[PDB]
Paper text:
In the absence of nucleotide or in saturating AMPPNP conditions, PfK5ΔL6-MD-SNAP had a comparatively high kMTlanding and a low koff, showing that when no nucleotide is present, or in its ATP-bound state, PfK5ΔL6-MD-SNAP has high MT affinity. We calculated 3D reconstructions of PfK5ΔL6-MD bound to MTs in the absence of nucleotide and in an ATP-like state, using AMPPNP. In the absence of bound nucleotide, density for all three NBS loops is visible in PfK5ΔL6-MD, although density for the P-loop in the no nucleotide state is poorly defined. In the no nucleotide state, density corresponding to loop9 and the P-loop is well separated, while density is observed connecting loop9 and 11. These configurations create an “open” NBS primed for ATP binding formed by a cavity between these three loops. Docking of a model of no nucleotide MT-bound kinesin-1 (33) into PfK5ΔL6-MD density reveals that the kinesin-1 switch loops fit poorly compared with the PfK5ΔL6-MD model, highlighting variations in the “open” NBS conformation between kinesins. In the PfK5ΔL6-MD no nucleotide reconstruction, no density is observed extending from helixα6, indicating that the neck linker is disordered in this nucleotide state. Interestingly, βlobe1/loop2 forms an interface area with α-tubulin of 181 and 145 Å2 in the no nucleotide and AMPPNP states, respectively. Density for loop5 is only well defined in the AMPPNP state and not the no nucleotide state, suggesting it is conformationally sensitive to bound nucleotide, as also observed with HsK5 loop5 (48).
Kinesins are motor proteins that bind to MTs and convert the energy of ATP binding and hydrolysis into MT-based mechanical work. Kinesin-5s form a tetrameric bipolar structure, with two opposing pairs of motor domains that can organize MT arrays such as those found in spindles. Here, we characterized P. falciparum kinesin-5 (PfK5) using cryo-EM to determine the motor's nucleotide-dependent microtubule-bound structure and introduced 3D classification of individual motors into our microtubule image processing pipeline to maximize our structural insights. Despite sequence divergence in PfK5, the motor exhibits classical kinesin mechanochemistry, including ATP-induced subdomain rearrangement and cover neck bundle formation, consistent with its plus-ended directed motility.
Author numbering:
A (entry chain A): 1 to 37, 47 to 437
B (entry chain B): 1 to 426
C (entry chain K): 18 to 119, 155 to 177, 184 to 207, 212 to 219, 226 to 309, 313 to 394
The structure:
Amino acid sequence: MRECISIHVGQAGVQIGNACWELYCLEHGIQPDGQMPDSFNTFFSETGAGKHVPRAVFVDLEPTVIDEVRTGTYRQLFHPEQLITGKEDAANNYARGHYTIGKEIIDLVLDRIRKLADQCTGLQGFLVFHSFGGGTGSGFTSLLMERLSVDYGKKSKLEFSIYPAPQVSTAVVEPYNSILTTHTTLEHSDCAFMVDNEAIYDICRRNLDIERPTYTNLNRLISQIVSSITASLRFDGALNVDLTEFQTNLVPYPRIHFPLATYAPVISAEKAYHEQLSVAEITNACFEPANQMVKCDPRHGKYMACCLLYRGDVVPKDVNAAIATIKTKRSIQFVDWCPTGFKVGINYQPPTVVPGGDLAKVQRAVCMLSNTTAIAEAWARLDHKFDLMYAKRAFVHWYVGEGMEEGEFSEAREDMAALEKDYEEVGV
Amino acid sequence: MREIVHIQAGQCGNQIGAKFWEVISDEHGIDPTGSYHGDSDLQLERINVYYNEAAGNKYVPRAILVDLEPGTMDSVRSGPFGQIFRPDNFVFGQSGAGNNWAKGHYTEGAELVDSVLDVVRKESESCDCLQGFQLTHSLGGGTGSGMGTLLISKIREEYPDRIMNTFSVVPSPKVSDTVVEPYNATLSVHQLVENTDETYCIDNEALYDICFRTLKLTTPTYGDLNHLVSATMSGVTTCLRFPGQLNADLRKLAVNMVPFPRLHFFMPGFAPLTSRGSQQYRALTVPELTQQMFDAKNMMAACDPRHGRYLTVAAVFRGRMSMKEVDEQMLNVQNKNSSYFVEWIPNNVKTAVCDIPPRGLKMSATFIGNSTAIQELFKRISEQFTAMFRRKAFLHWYTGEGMDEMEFTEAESNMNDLVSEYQQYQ
Amino acid sequence: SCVNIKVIVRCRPLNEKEKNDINNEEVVRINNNEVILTINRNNEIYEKKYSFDYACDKDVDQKTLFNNYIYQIVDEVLQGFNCTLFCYGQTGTGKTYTMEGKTGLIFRVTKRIFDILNKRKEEKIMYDFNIKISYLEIYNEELCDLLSSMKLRIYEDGLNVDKLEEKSINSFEEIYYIICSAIKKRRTAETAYNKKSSRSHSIFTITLIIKDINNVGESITKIGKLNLVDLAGSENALKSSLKIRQQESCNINQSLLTLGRVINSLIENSSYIPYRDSKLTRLLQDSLGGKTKTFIVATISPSSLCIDETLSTLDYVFRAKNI
Ligand SMILES: Nc1nc2c(ncn2[C@@H]2O[C@H](COP(=O)(O)CP(=O)(O)OP(=O)(O)O)[C@@H](O)[C@H]2O)c(=O)[nH]1
Ligand SMILES: Nc1nc2c(ncn2[C@@H]2O[C@H](COP(=O)(O)OP(=O)(O)OP(=O)(O)O)[C@@H](O)[C@H]2O)c(=O)[nH]1
Ligand SMILES: [Mg+2]
Ligand SMILES: [Mg+2]
C-alpha cells in the first residue's frame, strides 16, 4: 500500500526509536517475538507465516547504543541485519561523525537501507531521528542525508530532531554541532520537525504531573507526535490526509520547512477523572504557548499556517465549529499571506498509551503541526551561543584535527543567518 | 572495544594501581583469584575493556607494573589480586632511581624503558580496538617522573592515535619528601605538557586533608589516600563499562573538557563522601551529590576553586536518578555560582549519566574540574624550583648524569608559561 | 620596521586547465583595497567584500609586487629591522616556484639585497655585511633544516635549534646554488591534487649582520633578520583522499589554526600566551609585535572552478584584518 522506513541515528536517535517502536507495536498488537496472536505493512513487513518485522536501520558509532537494542526484549522482533555500530563514538564531534568515522559506516548503512527499499513498493518516505547537538546525530546523519538525497531523491525526507534548549545543555561543543548540522539540513531535508528538551520536561511536570521526568517520559511524548503524524498512513479517517498532502499544505515558500508541534490533551490519569475533554477544549489547548514542545511563544509572531489532526471520537461539524471558534480568537494571528491558513484532518483511530505511561487514555485527541515566525527565537538563541565559542575558536582544534576546514564554521554561520532572515521576511 | 592498557610506574603508581585493580575487579565480579563469579552479564559484556579474557574464565588485568626496586614487584604480588596480574608483566630493574629524574630518564631508566616498551607493544598489539593508555605515576621522584616521562613519550610516538590519559600525584607545597622535589617535578612537567593528552592532578596534601576532615579518619594511611584516588580513577572510566541514560567515552570527555589544547590539567573529586557516623544524616538524592560535589572543601587539589573561576567542569553521575533532576541541579549550580565560571563558555557543565551506581551506593558522582585555580599548584612548584636552581642547589646530582643546564632553563620556562596561561582566563 | 601587518592578495591569471573548464568564469573583482567576490551561491547575488592593503588583481606581475611591497620590506629590513613575511595560497598557484623563481620572492629579494649591499659597501668604503641562512621546515611536526644534508631540538637561551646550520653568505649565487640543492630535499605527501605535493611549512631565513662602519657608528651592529615563511596551505581532505593526510591535517591545518589564533591575539593585544601554542609560532615569535616588519601574502585564481577553495583562502586571510 503505502509505507515508511525509519532511520535512527545516535543514542537518542535509537532510544527515541525504541520507544516509537514500542508504541507502533502496541498499536497493532504485534508481540516482541514477531507473532500477532492490513495496514500493519506500513511498517512491519510480513516476512513469513507467524513473523512480522519493522522496517528500520539503527546506527551509532558506539557499540553500546545498539547492544542496548540487541539485548532488549525486542531482540526477537528486529532482524539482526538492522543493527549497525562503529567501534568508537563520534565524541560529540561533527567532523569525526562526518569525515573520519562515519566515512566507513555509511557504506554499511546505505546497503541496509537499499536492501529494505528494494523489498517494498509503497515507499513514500523515510523517517529519520537525530539531535542537532550530537556527533553521530550531526555529522553521520548529515552524511547519510546527503547520500539518501541521491539514492532516493523523490521519496519524502522527513525528520524529527532535537534542538538545544534555552538553558538545558548536555555538552559544551553542542553550539558548534548545531550550526554545522543546520547547514546540511537546509539543503537536503523536505520537512524537519523541531523538538525541544527543556520544554518537554516542563510539559511533563505541569501537564503530566511528573516531578522527576526521565528520558522515557520525554520519549513517550515524542512517540505520540510520531504516531499521530503517521496515523493517516495506518488507519482510515473521515478526512484522510496523506503524508505528502501535509507537505503540500505545509510550505508557503520553498525555504520554509521547519514546523513546530504539540499534542493535546496531555493530562495525567488522575486529572482524567474530572477533565471535560471536549473537541473544543482540546482544540483550544493546542493554541496555548504553554503547551508547545518547542520553546517559542506564538504570541510574539504570526502563523504561516496551521494543521490540526483530530483523532478518535470527533465529529466533523464539531471540529469545524471548534476551528471556527479559534478563528475569532484575535490573540492568534496569521500571516497576511494565508487567509485560508487552517487545514484539518480526522482519523477514526484514537492514539494509544504505552503501559507505564502517565498520559491518560482519552476518547479524543489532537496533534497540531504548525508553521510560525516564532521559530526564529530558537535560532537566535543558538547564534548567540555559537558566536561566543566561535569568536575565540574554543575547541575548534578538535574539529580541525578531524579534517574540518575553519571556513566551514564560517559558512555554516552565514547559512544559519540566512535561515533566520528568510523566516522573518515571510512573516508578511 | 575501546580497550585500555594500564601502565603503572613507581611505588606510588604501583600502590595506587594495586588499589585501582582491586576496586575494578570487584566491580566486574572478579575474585582475588582472577576467576569470574559475578552478579550480572553486564560485568562480562565489557570486562574486556580492562582485562584479557583467558581459559578458565580468568580475567587478567591488561596492565604493566614498573620500578628499579625489585621488592616493589613482589609487594604487588603479595596482595589479593596480585596473583591475577600477568606474571610476565612485572618489569623491573635493580638500582632505584635515587630520587633523580636524570637517572630515571637518561641512564638506568633508558634501559628499563626499552624493556617495558616492548611489553607495552605486545599488550597493545593484542587489542582489537584500543581507546588509550592509562598511566599512573607521581612527579615526585625518579621512576614515576623520569621513566614515566620517557616511556610515555615513546608510547605516544608509537601510538599517536590513542588517548594518553595520565593520573598523577603532584607534590605538596608543604608536605615535602626529597630535597629535590621541585627539580624532579619541574623536569617532568616540562615534557608532561607535550606528551600527555589528559592529566589528573592528584594532590597528596589535599588528599590527606579530605581523609582527615571530610571522612574524619583518625589515623589515615596511604591505603586510605589510595581509596579516594581509586574512586576517581574508577569513576572516570564508568560509561565505558557501565551503560546508561546518557553515555560517554574518554574521547567524548576530552572533547568537551579542553577548549585550548594546552590546558589539559584537571582537578579530580568524588561524591558522596561521609564519615561513618555522618551516614545517619545523609539526604541521599541528587541535591546531596550536587551540593557536596561543588563544595571546594572536597576538591582533591591544594588549589581552592573559589580563588578564581572554572573554565570547564564535568560530572558523571551514576545510579538511581532522573535526568530532569540532574539537569535542574546543574542549571541551578551555574546560576547560584555564576561568579565562579568563565563567561565565554555558554554552559560550563558537561554531564553524563550511568545507570549503575558504585557498589554500596544509591547514587554517586565523578567530578572533573578544569579550574583556573590550578595555577596555584604550578606557581607554588615554580617558586620552590627557582629558589633551588638560582643557587644551583643539588645541580651536581643532575648535571653529573649528563643533563645540560639548558634543560633546566627550558623546563622552568615551560612551567612559567603554563602558569601564565591558566591566569590568562581569570 | 616594527610589526605593522600589511596584507596582500594576488589574484592570478587562470591556468590552462582553469581556462579550458566550463567553470572558467571569473567571479572576482578587485578594487585597490577591497575584493568583491560575486556570490552566485544559490543564485543569491552578493558583493562579498574582503579588505586588503594590496588588493592585487590578475594583471599584477612579480616585479610590480616587488615594488608594491617587497621592495619596501627589504629596504626597511636592511636598515637593521627584522621582518617576517609569510605566504599562503591555493593549490595550482605554483607558489612553490613563486617563492623563489630565478624572478620570484627569494631571488628577487636576494638580487635586491645584494645590489643594495654592494652599493652600500661602496659607500662605506666593507659594511661588514654577513648573511646567515636556513630552511627550517616542518614535516609531521618535526623540524627539517633543508640547508643541511635529526635531533633538531628547539631551545631558547637566544631562540635557536640544536644543530641548526647557519650558512654564511657573501653572494646571490651562493644562495642560488644552495637553494637549487635545498629544493631537491623537499619531502612530499602523495595527494590527489599532486602526488608530490610539498608537505611542510618552510622558514627561509636570511639574517643580515649589519655594522654601521661610518666615521660614527662602527660599534653599532644591527640585524636584518628576514624570514620568508612558506606556510603550507590548508588541506582539503578530498584532495589528499592517507596516513600523512591525517598527520598533515594536524600539522598543517592545526598549525594554521594556531597561527590564526596567534595573529588574532596579536591584533587583539591579547598576545604572548599564543606564542607557545606551536613550534612554528615559537620559531616565528620574533614577528609577534616586536621590531619586525610584517607582511601577509596569499595567492588565488578567480575562476568559478576554484571558488570554494578561494573562499576558504580568503576567509583565513581576511581574518588577518577582520579576526
Ligand atoms: N597518594 C599517594 N601518594 C604516594 C603513595 N606512595 C608515595 N606517594 C607520594 O609520591 C612521592 C614519592 O614517590 P615514589 O615512591 O613514587 C618515587 P618512584 O618510586 O616513582 O621513583 P624512585 O625515585 O625510583 O623511588 C611522594 O609525594 C609520596 O608522598 C601512595 O600510596 N599514595
Ligand atoms: N528526548 C530524549 N532525550 C534524550 C534522549 N537521550 C538523550 N537525550 C537528548 O538527546 C541528546 C542526547 O545526545 P546523544 O544521543 O548522546 O548524542 P549523539 O548523537 O548520540 O552524539 P554521539 O553519540 O557523541 O555521536 C541530547 O540532545 C539530550 O537532551 C532520548 O532518548 N530522547
Ligand atoms: Mg554515540
Ligand atoms: Mg621507588
